[PDB]
Structure formats: C-alpha cells, structure tokens
Amino acid sequence: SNEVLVLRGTLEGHNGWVTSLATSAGQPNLLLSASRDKTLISWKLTGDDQKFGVPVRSFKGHSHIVQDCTLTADGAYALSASWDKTLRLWDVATGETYQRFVGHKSDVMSVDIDKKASMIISGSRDKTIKVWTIKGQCLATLLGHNDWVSQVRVVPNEKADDDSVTIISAGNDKMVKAWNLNQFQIEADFIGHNSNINTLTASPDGTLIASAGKDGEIMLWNLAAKKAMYTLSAQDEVFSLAFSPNRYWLAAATATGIKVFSLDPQYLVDDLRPEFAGYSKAAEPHAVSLAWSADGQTLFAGYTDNVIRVWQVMTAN
Amino acid sequence: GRVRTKTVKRASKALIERYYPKLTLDFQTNKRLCDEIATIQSKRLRNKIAGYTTHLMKRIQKGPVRGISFKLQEEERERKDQYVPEVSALDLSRSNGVLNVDNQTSDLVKSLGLKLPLSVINVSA
Amino acid sequence: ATRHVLMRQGVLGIKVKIMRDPAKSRTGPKALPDAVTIIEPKEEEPILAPSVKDY
RNA sequence: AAUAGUGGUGCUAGCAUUUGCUGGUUAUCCACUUCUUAGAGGGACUAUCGGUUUCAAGCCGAUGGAAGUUUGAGGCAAUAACA
C-alpha cells in the first residue's frame, strides 16, 4: 500500500563526513561515494542484509574537503570538486585521473555534466560560474550573484533534445537564478526564500523544481509556469534533497531526521530516523547526503559518523 | 595550559552579534567566513578566533547570551505561554464561588460598602 | 641611521631610532597584529513575500 | 633540476648459468620528479564524543591525526645608588 523502509545494510569506509553519494543509471551494482576526508570511494552493491561488500577503489588525489561527485549513466567516468580549486577527471577501473583544472579562487562548490557529454558546469564559492570542455577548456565565465553559491543543476531534458538546456543555481544571497546554456543568459529569477538557500533539486521529469534552505522552506517551482505552487515549511534545517526517479515522491534531508512527501496528495509516509548508542542527548548524529536507486527501490544515507545505511522500497502490509 | 586572551574573547562576541544567522555550529565552514566579513592580519589568529565562536555558539542552543539575541525578541515572545493556565489561579471557582477572609477585614469592605459573596472564619492568637 | 651633533650644547655619540605610523605604509603591512575590524552589514529587506517572476 | 637523483635504450665485464642476479661509464640517448633543494600556498582550532565544576572560566580521560607539555626551541621589550 505504502513505501515502508526497513534497514538493509551499513557501510563503514570513511573518517570524514560524506558529501555526495552517486548511483549509476546503467550499472545497478556499484555506488560512488565522496566524503570530507579527502577520499573518493566506489562501492560494490552486494545485496545482503548483513552488509554490502566491497569498496572497490580509492582515489588519493586531493588536499582538502571534496564537495560533490558526478558520473555517467553507465558508469564510465567520474568527476570531483575539492576545496583547493581542483577538478579531476577520473576513470572507473584503475584510478587514473585525467586532467586538473585552473579556474577559480575558492572552493569549487558544485559541478554537473550534460548527458550529451560535452560541457561541464561549475559553480564555486568565489561568486562565479564556469563551464568546461571534455578536454577541460574554458568557454565563458558567468557572474550575477553577490554571495556564495551552493548547488547548480542542469535541467533533465527529456524532450528528445529539443535544444532545451538551462542551469538552475542555489546561491547564498537568498536567490535562485536560472541560466541558459545555448544563449548563455539569465532565464528566470526565483524569489521567496528568506535565509541561506541550502539545496535544490528538480523533478526527474524536469518539470517540478524543489528548493529549500536553512529555515526549512521547501518552495516548489515549475519548469515553465515557474510559480510557487507548494511552499512547505519543513520547520527545521534541511541540508540536501531527494526525488524518487520513477514515482512521485519528493523527500528532504533535514538535520532532525529524514522526511518524505508525495507529490499529490501530501503523504508523510515515514520518518527515517536511525538508532545510535552512548550519547548525551544533545549529540545525536545526523545525515547530510542521500541517494536513490536506479529504479527507486533502494535508498542510501551517509551520516556524520561515517555510516551509510540502506533500505528497500517494499509495499506496506 | 591554554586559556584565551581577551582580544580573542572580545572579538569573538562582536562577530556573533553582527552575523548571527550566517554562523554555523561546524568550524570548517565559518573558518572560510571571517576573512570575508572581517580583516584578520595573521592566519593563526584567525584560527583561534573562529575556534571559540563555535564553542560559544553551542551555548546558544542551550541557554541565553551575554550579547543580544532576537529569540528574546521573538521566542521569548513565544514565551507568552510559559504556562498560561486555562483557568486562573485567582479564580473563586476554586473556592466554591465564595471568598474566605478573616474577621475584621470584612469590616473594610463594609466600610466602603460593597456587596461581595464572602465568608468569614475564626482566627487564633 | 647614525647622525652626530650640530648643536652648541651637547656632544657625545647621539643615536636616533625611528618607527613611523602604520596608516600610510604602502610597503608591506598596514596595521598592528592585534587589530581586528569587522564590517557593518547593511540593513535588510523585511520578509520577502514570494512574487516569483519568470526572461 | 649535468652544480640533485633514480627509470630505460645501448657500447660493456662478470655471468650458476640457460631466461638471470650484480656491475659498466660521459654525452648511449630518451623519458621522469617519489626521495633532494627552494619559491608559492595548505594544514591544528584543543577538533569530536564521555566525565567534572556556581555548569562558568577551565581541567581530566577517550578515539582520530604528521603534530594535541603555550605543538618543540629561541629572538624581542626599562624600574633602578656598582662614578
């Protein structure tokens, strides 16, 4: 009837905090995982309710905290954005990266890849946005903000490549701007968040844009009408966001647990809240990054004490 | 063997008063922040200044401040029901609708001459 | 900097040491290392009602 | 980076020899920076949890960490009778 999520595993391979996990659309058997501890870790999803087996590779190439990792659909390559103005073009088999980047003055905060595999966007903490080639060449800088930037997202162009690519950004000046690539221009200005914008993701259809900051203001947006349909108050601090790829469930990663919603109507199914031991109660660990399956049937959640737990989407009884 | 000098102590609470919504309980973020909003000459002095603000900032999640704090301006204005009772403690309904007073104080109300539903008891000593 | 006397009064090896004001330095540092200065930040918009706009 | 060094290609001697392990030196030539040197930056803040105290300044454990005795050691800092 409903999506209950029982505990299916636990990963222990880090000593920072995780910063971005990454699944492959093609390959359902691995997991890319990045963390604060200057490491990149690619996993092996050995389906077992005692553990999940092998972190098959490690990538020792950086000097500080990395922020977000991205990859191809089949699992061909991997990218990394570490705080020391560095970007690396990794393989997935050996560990040998390709080319570092010289393009910023700050932490490179968020990057993304087009599915046509031609341009790589980059937004960094020095209030500028940069695009890169596959061989790694500068094309155009982009300005417009005045505070920092947190996340940048490319639109899911599921309309059979009808020259429709656009970049949406999560700044830090309580501002959400939309940036074209084909014409290289501001597209839409999104207004309404009152504090530091923390995260944004759009629908897997590329149609419904969710945005939520520090106060817990989940403000929904459309792709074309681009309006404030739902303005949910998450009454907490949310760090990252979550969209079910196949279904219509939008989820949020608050500091007080894990909350889930349906698109229509409003169904608070579960609070994914794990269990710990040995704490004065002002010290409960909490997650910051989470990810779905390739079919939306498993959910991952990495936490501050380097535990990554997994669940499975079975029907409610 | 390590206590913090006042020039760490003083400027740590000046920074918390002008940029309080911008701060964060994690040290590694707002390490990158004080260079933006302030001018720190050395590097080790920045590392010490941002060190104790975050230690100061988790006091705020348990108690009040020795600066100013707009939780006084808003959440202590949410403390307008510290406990508002649904029926008052000063309600004569607790006293069966009749006031229980001493002997000669009943002459006080009879002096100003009012009609109140009061009862009178006996006094010792 | 070692300069002697052209005075009618007093003769022995006279010495002078010189450490000027830092507010006009233009070669290196400009303030003493104890100095800290935080900036003002500007007054705020009230509440920012949504009013989202589609360019 | 012939005013540091390894990695080969060689001329070249041993070679148990038989694939091999030690050599060979100007220039046999090419490719390298880990070790080396010096510029530019980074990194530690007592961090994170557990005790203790007017719950305050702090002090003790803990696991991480190159580093947790001001992180180790120095330089620099004027009141005064040695006529």
Coordinates of C-alpha atoms (C1' of nucleotides) in Angstrom, one line a residue:
Chain A
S1 CA 0.0 0.0 0.0
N2 CA 2.7 2.4 1.1
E3 CA 6.5 2.6 1.0
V4 CA 8.0 1.3 4.2
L5 CA 11.7 1.3 4.5
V6 CA 13.4 -1.4 6.7
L7 CA 17.1 -1.4 7.5
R8 CA 19.1 -3.4 4.9
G9 CA 22.8 -2.6 5.4
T10 CA 25.5 -0.4 6.8
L11 CA 28.7 0.9 5.2
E12 CA 31.9 1.7 7.2
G13 CA 34.7 3.1 4.9
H14 CA 35.3 6.7 5.9
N15 CA 36.5 9.0 8.5
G16 CA 35.2 12.4 7.4
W17 CA 31.6 13.1 6.7
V18 CA 30.1 12.1 3.4
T19 CA 29.4 14.9 1.0
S20 CA 27.8 13.3 -2.1
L21 CA 26.8 9.7 -3.0
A22 CA 26.3 8.7 -6.6
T23 CA 24.5 5.9 -8.3
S24 CA 24.7 4.8 -11.9
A25 CA 21.6 4.7 -14.1
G26 CA 23.1 1.9 -16.2
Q27 CA 25.0 -0.2 -13.6
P28 CA 22.9 -1.0 -10.5
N29 CA 25.8 -2.8 -8.7
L30 CA 28.1 0.0 -7.6
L31 CA 28.0 3.2 -5.6
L32 CA 30.2 6.2 -5.9
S33 CA 30.8 7.9 -2.6
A34 CA 32.7 11.1 -1.7
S35 CA 33.5 12.5 1.8
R36 CA 35.2 15.2 3.8
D37 CA 38.2 13.0 4.4
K38 CA 39.9 13.8 1.1
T39 CA 38.8 10.4 -0.3
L40 CA 36.7 9.1 -3.2
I41 CA 35.2 5.6 -2.7
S42 CA 33.4 3.4 -5.3
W43 CA 31.4 0.6 -3.9
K44 CA 30.0 -2.8 -4.8
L45 CA 26.3 -3.3 -4.0
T46 CA 26.5 -6.9 -2.9
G47 CA 22.8 -7.4 -2.0
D48 CA 22.8 -8.8 1.5
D49 CA 21.0 -7.9 4.7
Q50 CA 24.2 -8.3 6.8
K51 CA 26.4 -5.8 4.9
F52 CA 27.3 -4.6 1.4
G53 CA 30.7 -5.9 0.4
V54 CA 33.5 -4.1 -1.3
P55 CA 34.6 -0.5 -1.7
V56 CA 36.3 -1.5 -4.9
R57 CA 38.5 1.6 -5.4
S58 CA 40.0 4.5 -3.6
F59 CA 41.2 7.8 -5.2
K60 CA 44.1 9.6 -3.5
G61 CA 44.4 12.9 -5.4
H62 CA 43.4 15.8 -3.4
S63 CA 44.3 18.0 -0.4
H64 CA 41.1 19.2 1.2
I65 CA 37.3 18.5 1.5
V66 CA 35.6 17.5 -1.7
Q67 CA 32.0 18.6 -2.2
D68 CA 30.1 16.7 -5.0
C69 CA 30.9 13.9 -7.3
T70 CA 29.2 13.1 -10.6
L71 CA 29.5 10.3 -13.2
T72 CA 28.0 8.9 -16.4
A73 CA 24.8 6.8 -16.6
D74 CA 26.5 3.5 -17.5
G75 CA 29.3 4.3 -15.1
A76 CA 32.2 5.3 -17.4
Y77 CA 34.0 8.1 -15.6
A78 CA 33.8 10.3 -12.5
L79 CA 34.4 13.9 -11.5
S80 CA 35.4 15.6 -8.3
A81 CA 35.3 19.1 -6.9
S82 CA 37.7 19.6 -3.9
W83 CA 38.1 22.8 -2.0
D84 CA 41.6 23.7 -3.3
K85 CA 40.4 25.0 -6.7
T86 CA 40.8 21.5 -8.3
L87 CA 38.7 19.4 -10.6
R88 CA 39.7 15.9 -11.6
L89 CA 38.5 13.7 -14.5
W90 CA 38.6 10.1 -13.2
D91 CA 38.1 6.7 -14.8
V92 CA 36.2 4.0 -13.0
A93 CA 38.5 1.0 -13.4
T94 CA 42.1 1.8 -12.4
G95 CA 42.0 5.1 -10.5
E96 CA 44.0 7.1 -13.0
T97 CA 42.6 10.6 -13.4
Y98 CA 43.0 12.7 -16.5
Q99 CA 43.4 16.4 -16.1
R100 CA 43.3 19.0 -13.3
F101 CA 41.8 22.5 -13.7
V102 CA 43.0 26.0 -13.1
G103 CA 39.9 28.2 -12.9
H104 CA 38.8 29.6 -9.6
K105 CA 39.8 31.3 -6.4
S106 CA 37.8 29.3 -3.8
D107 CA 36.1 26.1 -3.1
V108 CA 34.6 24.7 -6.2
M109 CA 31.2 24.0 -4.8
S110 CA 29.0 22.2 -7.3
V111 CA 29.5 20.7 -10.8
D112 CA 27.3 18.9 -13.2
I113 CA 27.5 17.0 -16.6
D114 CA 25.3 17.1 -19.6
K115 CA 24.0 13.8 -20.9
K116 CA 25.3 14.7 -24.3
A117 CA 28.7 14.7 -22.6
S118 CA 30.0 17.9 -24.0
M119 CA 30.0 20.6 -21.3
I120 CA 30.7 20.6 -17.5
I121 CA 29.2 23.4 -15.5
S122 CA 30.9 24.6 -12.3
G123 CA 29.8 26.9 -9.5
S124 CA 32.4 27.9 -6.9
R125 CA 32.4 29.9 -3.7
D126 CA 34.1 33.0 -5.3
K127 CA 30.6 34.0 -6.7
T128 CA 31.3 32.9 -10.2
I129 CA 30.1 30.2 -12.5
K130 CA 32.3 28.4 -15.1
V131 CA 31.8 25.9 -17.9
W132 CA 34.4 23.4 -19.0
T133 CA 35.0 21.2 -22.0
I134 CA 35.6 17.5 -22.1
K135 CA 39.3 18.1 -22.5
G136 CA 38.9 20.8 -19.9
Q137 CA 39.0 24.2 -21.6
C138 CA 37.5 27.5 -20.6
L139 CA 34.5 28.7 -22.6
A140 CA 32.9 31.5 -20.6
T141 CA 32.8 32.8 -17.1
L142 CA 29.5 33.8 -15.6
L143 CA 28.7 36.3 -12.9
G144 CA 25.5 37.7 -11.4
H145 CA 25.4 36.8 -7.7
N146 CA 27.0 38.6 -4.9
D147 CA 27.0 35.9 -2.2
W148 CA 28.3 32.4 -2.3
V149 CA 26.7 29.5 -4.3
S150 CA 25.8 26.1 -3.1
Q151 CA 24.3 23.9 -5.8
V152 CA 23.9 24.1 -9.5
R153 CA 21.7 21.8 -11.5
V154 CA 21.2 21.1 -15.2
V155 CA 17.6 20.6 -16.4
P156 CA 16.6 17.0 -17.2
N157 CA 16.0 17.5 -21.0
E158 CA 13.6 14.6 -21.5
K159 CA 12.0 16.2 -24.6
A160 CA 14.2 14.4 -27.2
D161 CA 16.9 17.1 -27.2
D162 CA 14.9 20.0 -28.5
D163 CA 17.7 22.5 -27.8
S164 CA 16.5 22.9 -24.2
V165 CA 19.3 23.0 -21.7
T166 CA 19.3 25.5 -18.8
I167 CA 21.2 25.8 -15.4
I168 CA 19.5 26.5 -12.1
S169 CA 21.6 27.6 -9.2
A170 CA 21.4 27.6 -5.4
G171 CA 23.2 30.7 -4.3
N172 CA 23.6 32.3 -0.9
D173 CA 22.0 35.7 -1.3
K174 CA 18.5 34.2 -0.8
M175 CA 18.4 34.0 -4.5
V176 CA 17.6 31.2 -7.1
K177 CA 18.6 32.1 -10.7
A178 CA 18.1 30.2 -13.9
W179 CA 20.8 30.3 -16.6
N180 CA 20.6 29.3 -20.2
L181 CA 23.5 27.5 -21.9
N182 CA 22.5 27.7 -25.6
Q183 CA 22.1 31.5 -25.4
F184 CA 24.2 32.0 -22.2
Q185 CA 21.7 34.1 -20.3
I186 CA 19.6 34.5 -17.2
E187 CA 16.3 32.8 -17.7
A188 CA 14.2 33.2 -14.5
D189 CA 14.6 34.8 -11.1
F190 CA 13.1 32.9 -8.2
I191 CA 12.2 34.9 -5.1
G192 CA 10.8 33.9 -1.7
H193 CA 13.5 32.2 0.4
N194 CA 14.4 34.4 3.4
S195 CA 17.6 32.8 4.5
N196 CA 20.6 30.9 3.2
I197 CA 19.4 28.6 0.4
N198 CA 20.8 25.1 1.1
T199 CA 19.7 22.7 -1.6
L200 CA 17.6 22.4 -4.7
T201 CA 16.7 19.5 -7.0
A202 CA 14.1 19.3 -9.8
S203 CA 11.7 16.6 -10.8
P204 CA 13.1 13.6 -12.7
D205 CA 10.7 14.8 -15.4
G206 CA 12.5 18.1 -15.3
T207 CA 9.1 19.7 -14.6
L208 CA 8.8 20.4 -10.9
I209 CA 11.6 22.3 -9.1
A210 CA 12.0 22.0 -5.4
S211 CA 14.1 24.5 -3.3
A212 CA 14.7 24.5 0.4
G213 CA 17.2 26.5 2.5
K214 CA 18.2 27.0 6.1
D215 CA 14.9 27.8 7.7
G216 CA 13.2 24.8 6.2
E217 CA 11.2 26.5 3.5
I218 CA 10.5 23.9 0.8
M219 CA 9.3 26.2 -2.0
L220 CA 8.2 24.3 -5.1
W221 CA 8.6 25.6 -8.6
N222 CA 7.5 24.6 -12.1
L223 CA 9.6 24.3 -15.2
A224 CA 7.6 26.7 -17.4
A225 CA 4.9 28.4 -15.3
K226 CA 7.7 28.6 -12.7
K227 CA 5.4 29.5 -9.8
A228 CA 5.1 28.9 -6.1
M229 CA 2.6 26.1 -6.0
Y230 CA 3.7 24.4 -2.8
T231 CA 5.5 26.4 -0.1
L232 CA 6.2 23.7 2.5
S233 CA 7.6 24.7 5.9
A234 CA 10.0 21.9 7.0
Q235 CA 10.3 23.7 10.4
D236 CA 13.9 22.7 10.7
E237 CA 17.2 22.9 8.9
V238 CA 17.4 20.8 5.7
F239 CA 20.7 20.0 4.1
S240 CA 20.0 18.1 0.9
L241 CA 17.0 16.9 -1.1
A242 CA 15.6 13.8 -2.7
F243 CA 13.4 12.9 -5.6
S244 CA 12.1 9.4 -6.4
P245 CA 13.1 8.7 -10.0
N246 CA 10.1 6.5 -11.0
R247 CA 7.4 7.5 -8.5
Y248 CA 6.2 11.0 -7.5
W249 CA 7.8 11.1 -4.0
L250 CA 9.9 14.1 -3.0
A251 CA 12.0 13.8 0.1
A252 CA 14.1 16.1 2.2
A253 CA 17.2 15.5 4.4
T254 CA 16.7 17.6 7.5
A255 CA 19.0 17.7 10.5
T256 CA 16.3 16.3 12.7
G257 CA 15.8 13.1 10.7
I258 CA 14.6 12.2 7.2
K259 CA 11.2 13.4 6.0
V260 CA 9.3 12.2 2.9
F261 CA 6.4 13.6 0.9
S262 CA 4.3 12.5 -2.0
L263 CA 3.6 15.0 -4.8
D264 CA -0.2 14.9 -4.7
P265 CA -1.6 14.5 -2.1
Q266 CA 0.5 15.2 0.9
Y267 CA 1.6 11.9 2.5
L268 CA 4.1 12.0 5.3
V269 CA 4.9 8.3 5.0
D270 CA 7.8 7.7 7.4
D271 CA 10.5 9.5 9.3
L272 CA 13.7 7.6 8.6
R273 CA 15.4 8.0 11.9
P274 CA 18.2 5.5 12.7
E275 CA 19.4 4.3 16.1
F276 CA 22.6 5.1 18.0
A277 CA 24.2 4.3 21.3
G278 CA 26.0 6.2 24.1
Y279 CA 25.0 9.8 23.9
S280 CA 24.1 12.8 26.0
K281 CA 21.1 13.7 24.0
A282 CA 22.4 16.9 22.5
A283 CA 24.7 14.8 20.4
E284 CA 22.7 12.6 18.0
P285 CA 24.4 12.0 14.7
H286 CA 22.6 13.1 11.5
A287 CA 22.9 12.7 7.8
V288 CA 23.8 15.2 5.2
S289 CA 23.7 13.3 1.9
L290 CA 21.3 10.7 0.4
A291 CA 20.6 8.9 -2.8
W292 CA 18.0 6.7 -4.5
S293 CA 18.3 3.5 -6.6
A294 CA 18.4 3.4 -10.4
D295 CA 14.8 2.2 -10.1
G296 CA 13.9 4.0 -6.9
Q297 CA 13.8 0.7 -5.0
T298 CA 16.7 1.4 -2.6
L299 CA 17.7 4.5 -0.7
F300 CA 21.1 5.3 0.7
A301 CA 22.0 7.7 3.6
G302 CA 25.5 8.6 4.7
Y303 CA 25.9 10.2 8.1
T304 CA 28.5 12.2 10.1
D305 CA 30.0 9.1 11.9
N306 CA 30.8 7.6 8.5
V307 CA 27.9 5.1 8.5
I308 CA 26.0 4.7 5.2
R309 CA 22.7 2.8 5.7
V310 CA 20.4 1.3 3.1
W311 CA 16.8 0.5 2.9
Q312 CA 14.5 -1.2 0.3
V313 CA 11.2 0.1 -1.0
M314 CA 8.7 -2.6 -0.3
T315 CA 5.0 -2.3 -0.1
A316 CA 3.3 -1.7 3.2
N317 CA 1.5 -4.6 4.8
Chain B
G1 CA 47.7 25.5 29.9
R2 CA 45.6 27.2 27.3
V3 CA 43.1 30.0 28.1
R4 CA 42.1 32.6 25.6
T5 CA 43.2 36.2 25.8
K6 CA 40.5 39.0 25.8
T7 CA 41.3 40.0 22.2
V8 CA 40.2 36.6 21.2
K9 CA 37.4 36.8 23.8
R10 CA 36.1 40.3 22.9
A11 CA 36.1 40.0 19.2
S12 CA 34.5 36.6 19.2
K13 CA 31.4 38.1 20.6
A14 CA 31.5 41.1 18.3
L15 CA 31.3 38.8 15.3
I16 CA 28.5 36.8 16.8
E17 CA 26.4 40.0 17.1
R18 CA 26.5 41.2 13.5
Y19 CA 26.3 37.9 11.6
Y20 CA 24.4 35.5 13.8
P21 CA 22.1 33.9 11.2
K22 CA 25.2 33.4 9.0
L23 CA 27.1 31.4 11.5
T24 CA 27.1 27.6 11.8
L25 CA 27.9 25.0 14.5
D26 CA 30.6 23.5 12.2
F27 CA 34.1 25.0 12.5
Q28 CA 35.3 24.2 9.0
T29 CA 32.7 26.3 7.2
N30 CA 33.0 29.6 9.1
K31 CA 36.7 29.3 9.1
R32 CA 36.2 30.4 5.5
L33 CA 33.9 33.2 6.6
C34 CA 35.8 35.6 8.9
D35 CA 38.1 36.7 6.2
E36 CA 35.1 37.8 4.2
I37 CA 33.4 39.8 6.9
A38 CA 36.4 41.0 8.8
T39 CA 40.1 41.7 8.5
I40 CA 42.5 39.3 10.3
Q41 CA 46.1 40.1 9.9
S42 CA 47.8 36.8 10.6
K43 CA 46.5 33.2 10.0
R44 CA 46.8 31.6 13.4
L45 CA 44.9 34.4 14.9
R46 CA 42.0 33.7 12.6
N47 CA 42.2 30.0 13.6
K48 CA 41.9 30.9 17.2
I49 CA 39.1 33.5 16.8
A50 CA 36.8 31.2 14.9
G51 CA 37.7 28.4 17.3
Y52 CA 35.9 29.8 20.3
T53 CA 32.9 31.3 18.5
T54 CA 31.6 27.9 17.5
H55 CA 32.3 26.8 21.1
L56 CA 30.3 29.9 22.1
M57 CA 27.6 29.1 19.5
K58 CA 26.6 25.9 21.0
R59 CA 25.8 27.6 24.3
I60 CA 23.0 29.4 22.3
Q61 CA 21.4 26.0 21.7
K62 CA 21.1 25.5 25.4
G63 CA 20.9 28.9 27.2
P64 CA 20.9 32.6 26.7
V65 CA 23.6 35.0 25.6
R66 CA 25.7 37.8 27.1
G67 CA 25.2 39.8 23.9
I68 CA 21.9 40.4 22.3
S69 CA 19.6 37.7 20.9
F70 CA 16.4 38.1 19.0
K71 CA 15.0 34.9 20.5
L72 CA 14.3 37.3 23.3
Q73 CA 12.6 39.5 20.6
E74 CA 10.7 36.6 19.2
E75 CA 10.9 33.2 21.0
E76 CA 10.7 34.8 24.4
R77 CA 7.7 36.5 22.8
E78 CA 6.8 32.9 22.2
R79 CA 7.3 32.5 25.9
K80 CA 4.0 34.3 26.5
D81 CA 2.6 31.0 27.5
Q82 CA 5.4 29.9 29.8
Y83 CA 2.3 28.4 31.3
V84 CA -0.9 30.4 30.8
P85 CA -3.5 28.3 32.7
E86 CA -6.8 27.6 31.1
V87 CA -8.4 28.6 34.4
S88 CA -6.9 31.2 36.6
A89 CA -5.3 30.5 40.0
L90 CA -7.1 33.6 41.2
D91 CA -10.5 32.1 40.4
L92 CA -13.1 32.0 43.1
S93 CA -14.5 28.8 41.5
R94 CA -11.6 27.1 43.2
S95 CA -13.1 28.5 46.5
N96 CA -16.6 27.2 45.7
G97 CA -17.6 30.7 44.4
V98 CA -17.1 32.3 47.8
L99 CA -14.2 34.3 49.3
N100 CA -12.6 33.1 52.5
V101 CA -11.4 36.1 54.6
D102 CA -10.5 37.0 58.2
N103 CA -12.9 38.6 60.6
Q104 CA -12.2 42.3 60.7
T105 CA -11.2 42.6 57.1
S106 CA -14.9 42.1 56.4
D107 CA -15.4 45.5 58.0
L108 CA -13.0 47.0 55.4
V109 CA -15.4 46.1 52.6
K110 CA -18.4 47.1 54.7
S111 CA -16.6 50.4 55.2
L112 CA -16.5 51.2 51.5
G113 CA -19.8 49.3 51.4
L114 CA -19.8 46.7 48.7
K115 CA -21.8 43.5 48.1
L116 CA -19.4 40.6 47.7
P117 CA -20.0 36.9 48.2
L118 CA -17.6 36.3 51.0
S119 CA -17.4 34.0 54.0
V120 CA -15.9 34.6 57.5
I121 CA -13.9 32.3 59.6
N122 CA -12.4 32.2 63.1
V123 CA -8.9 33.5 64.0
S124 CA -6.5 32.2 66.6
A125 CA -3.9 34.1 68.8
Chain C
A1 CA 70.8 56.0 10.6
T2 CA 73.7 57.3 12.7
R3 CA 73.9 61.1 12.9
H4 CA 76.0 63.3 15.2
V5 CA 75.7 66.7 16.7
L6 CA 75.4 70.2 15.2
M7 CA 74.3 71.8 18.5
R8 CA 76.1 74.3 20.6
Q9 CA 75.4 72.4 23.8
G10 CA 75.9 68.7 24.0
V11 CA 78.4 66.3 22.5
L12 CA 78.6 62.5 22.7
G13 CA 77.6 59.7 20.4
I14 CA 73.9 60.5 19.9
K15 CA 71.6 58.0 18.4
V16 CA 68.1 58.0 17.0
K17 CA 65.7 55.2 16.2
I18 CA 62.6 55.6 14.0
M19 CA 59.4 53.5 13.8
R20 CA 56.6 55.5 12.0
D21 CA 52.8 55.3 12.0
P22 CA 51.3 52.4 10.0
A23 CA 48.2 54.0 8.5
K24 CA 50.1 55.2 5.3
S25 CA 52.6 52.4 4.9
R26 CA 52.3 51.3 1.2
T27 CA 55.2 48.8 1.6
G28 CA 54.0 45.7 3.4
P29 CA 51.8 45.6 6.5
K30 CA 49.4 48.4 7.5
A31 CA 48.1 47.5 11.0
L32 CA 49.4 46.1 14.2
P33 CA 48.7 42.3 14.6
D34 CA 46.3 42.8 17.4
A35 CA 44.0 44.9 15.3
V36 CA 40.7 43.4 14.1
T37 CA 37.9 45.1 12.1
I38 CA 34.6 43.7 11.2
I39 CA 32.3 45.3 8.6
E40 CA 28.8 46.7 9.2
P41 CA 26.5 44.7 7.2
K42 CA 23.7 46.7 5.5
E43 CA 20.0 46.8 6.6
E44 CA 17.7 44.1 5.4
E45 CA 14.7 43.6 3.3
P46 CA 11.7 42.9 5.6
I47 CA 10.2 39.5 4.8
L48 CA 10.5 38.8 1.0
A49 CA 6.9 37.7 0.0
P50 CA 7.3 35.2 -2.8
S51 CA 6.3 37.1 -6.0
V52 CA 8.3 34.8 -8.3
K53 CA 9.0 36.0 -11.8
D54 CA 9.6 34.1 -15.0
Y55 CA 13.4 36.3 -19.2
Chain D
rA1 C1' 66.6 20.2 -11.9
rA2 C1' 74.7 17.5 -15.9
rU3 C1' 76.4 22.4 -9.9
rA4 C1' 70.4 16.8 -7.3
rG5 C1' 68.7 11.9 -8.3
rU6 C1' 66.5 7.2 -9.7
rG7 C1' 63.9 4.8 -15.0
rG8 C1' 65.1 2.7 -19.5
rU9 C1' 67.8 2.1 -24.5
rG10 C1' 72.8 1.0 -25.6
rC11 C1' 78.6 0.3 -26.2
rU12 C1' 80.4 -3.3 -21.9
rA13 C1' 82.5 -7.0 -17.8
rG14 C1' 81.1 -10.9 -14.8
rC15 C1' 78.0 -14.2 -15.6
rA16 C1' 75.3 -20.7 -11.7
rU17 C1' 74.2 -20.1 -15.8
rU18 C1' 70.2 -21.1 -19.7
rU19 C1' 65.7 -16.7 -19.0
rG20 C1' 69.3 -14.5 -14.6
rC21 C1' 71.2 -11.6 -10.4
rU22 C1' 75.4 -7.7 -9.7
rG23 C1' 78.4 -4.5 -12.3
rG24 C1' 79.8 -0.7 -17.0
rU25 C1' 80.7 4.9 -18.0
rU26 C1' 80.2 10.7 -20.5
rA27 C1' 77.5 12.5 -23.5
rU28 C1' 74.5 5.7 -25.3
rC29 C1' 70.3 8.7 -25.9
rC30 C1' 65.4 9.2 -24.3
rA31 C1' 61.7 9.5 -20.5
rC32 C1' 61.0 11.1 -15.3
rU33 C1' 60.4 14.1 -10.2
rU34 C1' 58.9 9.7 -5.1
rC35 C1' 63.3 10.6 -2.4
rU36 C1' 66.7 16.2 -2.9
rU37 C1' 66.8 21.6 -3.0
rA38 C1' 64.0 26.3 -3.0
rG39 C1' 59.6 29.6 -4.2
rA40 C1' 54.1 29.6 -3.9
rG41 C1' 50.2 28.0 -0.9
rG42 C1' 47.6 24.4 2.6
rG43 C1' 47.0 22.3 7.3
rA44 C1' 45.5 22.5 14.4
rC45 C1' 41.4 25.1 16.4
rU46 C1' 42.4 21.6 21.9
rA47 C1' 38.8 19.2 16.9
rU48 C1' 34.8 15.2 18.1
rC49 C1' 32.4 12.3 21.8
rG50 C1' 32.4 10.8 27.9
rG51 C1' 33.1 12.6 32.7
rU52 C1' 33.7 17.0 36.4
rU53 C1' 32.9 22.2 38.2
rU54 C1' 28.4 28.2 40.7
rC55 C1' 27.5 24.0 34.7
rA56 C1' 31.1 29.4 34.4
rA57 C1' 36.5 30.1 33.0
rG58 C1' 38.7 25.6 32.6
rC59 C1' 40.8 20.6 34.0
rC60 C1' 41.0 15.2 33.2
rG61 C1' 40.1 10.8 30.0
rA62 C1' 38.9 8.9 25.4
rU63 C1' 39.3 7.5 19.5
rG64 C1' 41.2 10.2 15.0
rG65 C1' 45.5 12.8 13.5
rA66 C1' 52.5 14.3 10.6
rA67 C1' 51.5 17.0 15.0
rG68 C1' 47.1 17.6 21.0
rU69 C1' 53.6 19.6 27.6
rU70 C1' 52.0 27.9 25.2
rU71 C1' 52.8 21.6 19.5
rG72 C1' 59.1 21.5 20.3
rA73 C1' 63.3 25.8 20.9
rG74 C1' 64.8 30.6 20.8
rG75 C1' 64.8 36.3 19.4
rC76 C1' 62.4 40.7 21.1
rA77 C1' 60.5 44.6 25.0
rA78 C1' 63.2 49.8 31.1
rU79 C1' 62.2 50.5 37.2
rA80 C1' 66.6 51.1 39.5
rA81 C1' 72.8 54.3 44.2
rC82 C1' 78.1 49.1 41.4
rA83 C1' 81.0 57.0 39.3

